[PDB]
Design a protein around this nucleic acid. Structure first.
Length: 52
DNA sequence: CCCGTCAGACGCTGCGCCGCCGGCGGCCGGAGAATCCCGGTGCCGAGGCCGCCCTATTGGTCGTAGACAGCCCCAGCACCGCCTAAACGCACGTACGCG
């Protein structure tokens, strides 16, 4: 089997794979819906793009 | 002759004119003092590149949040009538305010 990054699978650049781990250790919740981080990383890329 | 009336000239008063002076205002010239570029020079640090590995991704699972399906029932909403305090309009005037 071959693996592909999730960021590409969303057509995104920011590290969905990394940021998902952050909420897991961030203790904001005990369980995270897998859909949430993909949404989250998308937001940041929009925000960062807006400023520069 | 002088007074009296009216008339005419004088003196005084009020005015504008007249010239002077001042002040003001405006406008400008140009010094000149900064800022502003403009070009020459040289880094050091982006940026770029390479090694590498730890984490991200994959497969599987399993068990449990949570949907959802259904349900009861409070209590939020209508509305209805009677009441009056509460709101409203104006009427001054003086006092904050603004210059």
């Amino acid at each position: 089997a071959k693996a592909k990054t999730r960021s590409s699978r969303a057509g995104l650049q920011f590290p969905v794979g990394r940021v998902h781990r952050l909420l897991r250790k961030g203790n904001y919740a005990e369980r995270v819906g897998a859909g949430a981080p993909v949404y989250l990383a998308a937001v940041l890329e929009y925000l960062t793009a807006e400023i520069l």
